A paper describes a structure:
The tetrameric transcription factors p53, p63, and p73 evolved from a common ancestor and play key roles in tumor suppression and development. Surprisingly, p63 and p73 require a second helix in their tetramerization domain for the formation of stable tetramers that is absent in human p53, raising questions about the evolutionary processes leading to diversification. Here we determined the crystal structure of the zebrafish p53 tetramerization domain, which contains a second helix, reminiscent of p63 and p73, combined with p53-like features. Crystallographic studies on the zebrafish p53 tetramerization domain then confirmed the presence of the p63/p73 signature helix in p53 proteins of a subgroup of bony fishes, providing evidence that the last common ancestor of p53, p63, and p73 also had an extended domain with an additional helix that was subsequently lost in many modern-day p53 proteins as a result of divergent evolution.
To see whether the C-terminal helix of the zebrafish p53 tetramerization domain plays an equally pivotal role in stabilizing the overall architecture of the tetramer, we created a deletion variant comprising residues 302-331, DRp53(302-331). SEC-MALS showed that the truncated domain remained tetrameric at high micromolar concentrations, with the tetramers partially dissociating at low micromolar concentration. We determined its structure in three different crystal forms grown at different pH (5.0, 7.0, and 9.0) and ionic strength, up to a resolution of 1.0 Å. In all three structures, DRp53(302–331) forms essentially identical tetramers with orthogonal packing of primary dimers as observed for the full-length tetramerization domain. The last turn of helix H1 partially unwinds in the truncated domain, and in some chains, the C-terminal carboxylate group of Val331 folds back onto the tetramer and forms a salt bridge with Arg314 from an adjacent subunit, thereby displacing Asp229 that normally interacts with the arginine. Analysis of the salt-bridge patterns in different tetramers further revealed that Glu326 (Glu349 in human) can adopt alternative conformations and in some chains interacts directly with the guanidinium group of Arg314. This observation of fluctuating salt-bridge partners in the truncated zebrafish domain supports molecular dynamics simulations on the human protein, suggesting that the stabilizing Arg337-Asp352 salt bridge is part of a larger fluid salt-bridging cluster that includes Glu349 (Lwin et al., 2007). Taken together, the crystal structures of the truncated domain show that, although the second helix forms additional intersubunit contacts that stabilize the tetramer, it is not essential to the overall assembly geometry, which is stable across a broad range of pH and ionic strength. In contrast, the packing angle of the H1 helices in zebrafish p53 is not significantly affected by deletion of the second helix, and the truncated domain has essentially the same dimer and tetramer architecture as human p53.
Author numbering:
A (entry chain C): 300 to 331
B (entry chain D), D (entry chain A): 303 to 331
C (entry chain B): 303 to 330
Amino acid sequence: GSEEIFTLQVRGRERYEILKKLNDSLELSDVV
Amino acid sequence: EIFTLQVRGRERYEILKKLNDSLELSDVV
Amino acid sequence: EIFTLQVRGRERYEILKKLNDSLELSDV
Amino acid sequence: EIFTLQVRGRERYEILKKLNDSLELSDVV
């Protein structure tokens, strides 16, 4: 097998929100 | 302010890591 | 509603294309 | 070596521009 879980530490709320939206997008689209 | 972002999959992690590290260096946001 | 983004370099393009394609699909 | 991305929507475009600009600035040896 299964995909493993990895964690990224992000500094800044605006930066986090962008990266979260990308992560969530990729989960839905499965592009990566 | 520090957050954790939990990512499924090594390839997905690698793309987000590249972006995070880039943003830390550039300070664009 | 369509905007052109100029990107320098293949690796940079390939990253951003993956994201753009993903966002097109997850835009619900 | 210029590529173009067609991005639909202001908000999406603004995110991808920030990332592009960041990756240009963090492109260091």
